[PDB]
Amino acid sequence: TKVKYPDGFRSWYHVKSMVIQPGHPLENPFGGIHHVYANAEAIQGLRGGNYPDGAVLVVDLFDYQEDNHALVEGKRKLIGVMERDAKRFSATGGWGYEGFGEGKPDKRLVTDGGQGCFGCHAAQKESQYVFSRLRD
Amino acid sequence: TKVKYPDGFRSWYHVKSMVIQPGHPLENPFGGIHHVYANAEAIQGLRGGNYPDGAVLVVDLFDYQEDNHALVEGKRKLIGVMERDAKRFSATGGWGYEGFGEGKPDKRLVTDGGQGCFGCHAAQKESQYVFSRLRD
Ligand code: HEC
Ligand code: HEC
Ligand SMILES: [Zn+2]
Ligand SMILES: [Zn+2]
Description:
Two copies of one chain form a homodimer. Chain A has three helices and five strands.
């Protein structure tokens, strides 16, 4: 019941992006420029199907520097990971929730079996616990 | 001697992003959240390899809205497209330059054969007229 490191996620489908600036309620620790990625499996859910076991969503969080009215991507802060397994991740609505510090497999961030992550993602039960909307 | 609309570019490898805000010298018309994408042939070039004919880079430019210490993606403004053909686009350094308003295939923007585009990109001769760098 550990979430696997999503090897190769940077080659996945880019779902969407958002900037969370200082002062945002989620600034600790979501502050930065973030990009949402989906594997083949997760695309099926985003398109309006059921999320199949093996679907993985990644949220890739970068620091940024405001440089003359450009926001410029700096170092990666972390990745958040949601891993669909209806049986193994049953306690958290069938998604496994993990963080990797600087996107490194060695730096697991989740210490409460993902109940905190699940606490907020539960509001989205009707879209299978997923906030991001697939956009053209 | 026309740049092909890059059908399916939303499914390609996401290279990088940047935000250009009010007050940036490039605000008009490059203002917004932009995402750079690369087809397989473009990735060869970006990796430090050479760009094969048929390499395509896309810059996808979104309007954004302020939303309580968040910049949220709004409407697509346009896409910019560079298509590799050393022979057919030799007047603009082996890349064909085109813009599509709102990313629509029917709203081609470039009127000067891409000389305007090439004029700025020519700064980057030493990285084959590409600004963007592959990051992890
Ligand atoms: C609310 C107080 C949140 C808590 C706690 C967590 N997440 Fe979340 N998450 C939240 C929002 C509003 C979004 C959407 C961002 C966007 O650009 O629209 C997200 C997104 C994710 C994603 C991308 C998939 C999706 O649901 O859109 C992942 C992979 C994700 N979050 C993981 C994650 C983990 C591992 C958490 C605990 C450490 C976690 N989130 C907490 C809101 C909230
Ligand atoms: C300088 C005044 C520019 C002019 C005029 C044009 N472009 Fe450009 N382009 C510019 C920069 C600084 C960047 C990098 C942005 C980043 O996030 O790093 C770009 C990028 C592109 C891309 C992505 C590929 C790359 O070189 O990084 C494409 C596909 C692209 N630009 C196309 C484009 C076209 C079609 C133009 C004429 C309409 C054009 N550019 C003008 C700077 C400048
Ligand atoms: Zn405020
Ligand atoms: Zn500014």
